[PDB]
Amino acid sequence: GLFGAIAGFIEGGWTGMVDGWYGYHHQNEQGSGYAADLKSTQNAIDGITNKVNSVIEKMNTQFTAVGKEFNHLEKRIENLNKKVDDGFLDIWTYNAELLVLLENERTLDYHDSNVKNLYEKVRSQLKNNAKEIGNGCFEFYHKCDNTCMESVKNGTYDYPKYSEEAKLNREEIDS
């Protein structure tokens, strides 16, 4: 991975998350489960769809008959006609092969960037109220119910609200 998130510090993907491309696995006393981040998933789908549409829609053609008929005394123009067809075949094949090769690399890195951004967005929200434990995972120093959980998914986590609750727990785990 270019950004080191997919197949990087997040070692593997989740098959339990089927409603989206990127999301979360939560765990609290109320239970545990998988959920997909609606905001980041939809913004990545739009880019990919635009990417596919751009490749296809920019190719606009018109009515044209390739077939040309020549006699046995018109070899040179027949060879000229063949030279035109073969040259177009080589040009289109090389561009099409390289376009897919380069864009496939771009698409995978695009997913890598989105996963990395989502982790950093959560990191900026929690700050020192949570401990990074690898695998793209956070451990809360304070209790976090279902309302607190989706509030991170909402994007509306209240750091000062649990700042003193987490700070007291922070200085006791580390002896």
Partner: protein, 55 residues
């Protein structure tokens, strides 16, 4: 040399006559006169497909 049991040759010709035009034929012999003529309007483009695929 005999081609389909023929030693004589027959060269065929064609031309297009625009509206408001006259075509004149003159010969003392060795002429194959037309019998049927086609009135047509060419469509620009298109080609000819040579294959055994049914339609």
């Amino acid at each position: 040399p005999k081609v389909r049991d023929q030693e004589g040759r027959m060269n065929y010709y064609w031309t297009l006559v625009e509206p408001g035009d006259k075509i004149t034929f003159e010969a003392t012999g060795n002429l194959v006169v037309p019998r049927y003529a086609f009135a047509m309007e060419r469509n620009a483009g298109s080609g000819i497909i040579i294959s055994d695929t049914p339609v």
